[PDB]
């Protein structure tokens, strides 16, 4: 119950997302 298809989020949950991706881009 937690994929990432069309269940897009909206506000905030978007701030934690690029913080989760930029994360996989350089957890450093």
Partner 1 sequence: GIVDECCLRPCSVDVLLSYC
In the complex, which residues of this chain contact partner 1 (CB under 8 A)?
A: 4-6, 8-11, 14, 17-18, 21-22, 25
Shortest CB 18 distance to partner 1, Å? 5
Distances (CA, A) of 27 to 6, 10, 11: 27, 24, 23
Shortest CB 19 distance to partner 1, Å? 9
Q: How many CB atoms lie within 10 A of CB 26?
A: 6
Q: Of 2 and 8, which CB lies nearer to partner 1 in the complex structure?
A: 8
Shortest CB 1 distance to partner 1, Å? 18
User: d(Cα 26, Cα 19) in Å, to the nearest integer?
Assistant: 10
């Amino acid at each position: 119950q937690q994929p990432q298809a069309v269940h897009t989020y909206c506000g905030r949950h978007l701030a934690r997302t690029l913080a989760d991706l930029c994360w996989e881009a350089g957890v450093d």
